[PDB]
């Protein structure tokens with residue numbers, strides 16, 4: 001049965017586009033990953049420069065990059081026990097920012113698993129593109145679910161959402177943070193009040209980073225990670241907190 005079955009999914013925009021203290025920050029990212037030790041890890045805004053500390057995680061994970069060599073891209077890292085069946089990268093047709101829906105399909109044990117990682121169009125101005133992408137992603141999730149009854153499906157990443165932007169979420173698909181209890185202490189994943197990696201914002205807080213799921217696991221625990229300043233350079237690993245969700249029966 002699925003009782004005692006448990007899988008953890010972590011997602012993090014690692015702010016690779018910010019060149020300041022990039023190597024130290026990527027080392028910190030890899031450090032935090034090894035300590036949280038998630039089964040599955042989604043990354044966004046990964047860059048080629050100073051990727052080594054991340055790439056070195058291949059001793060612990062299989063690493064799939066959405067579009068390596070592009071200005072920035074996403075990654076999905078899975079346990080070496082994850083049996084990969086397909087890796088598909090869908091380029092959003094309406095994107096001016098090389099954004100993609102990265103899909104890794106496989107299984108761990110006997111359980112079919114679909115992993116969908118994205119970084120939706122950025123900024124208030126691109127609401128049109130972003131809302132269309134989200135809808136498109138949900139349609140894809142709806143289809144995967146229909147085609148694979150009994151599968152675990154995880155969809156998320158940096159969705160850049162304001163709540164009023166969330167559209168057609170299928171019944172059966174739940175938001176991990178909400179299902180864990182809509183805890184205020186774990187709500188905002190991009191918090192310019194507390195995160196000072198970026199200047200010029202003036203106290204904006206958003207729940208940009210989210211994880212949705214469908215499947216035979218009905219309970220979820222949800223925490224934030226990467227919230228500690230790096231001592232040597234006095235910055236956070238990223239201007240985003242990581243989200244960390246543990247799904248169980």
Ligand SMILES: [Mg+2]
Pocket residue numbers: 015016017018045
């Ligand atoms: Mg950035």
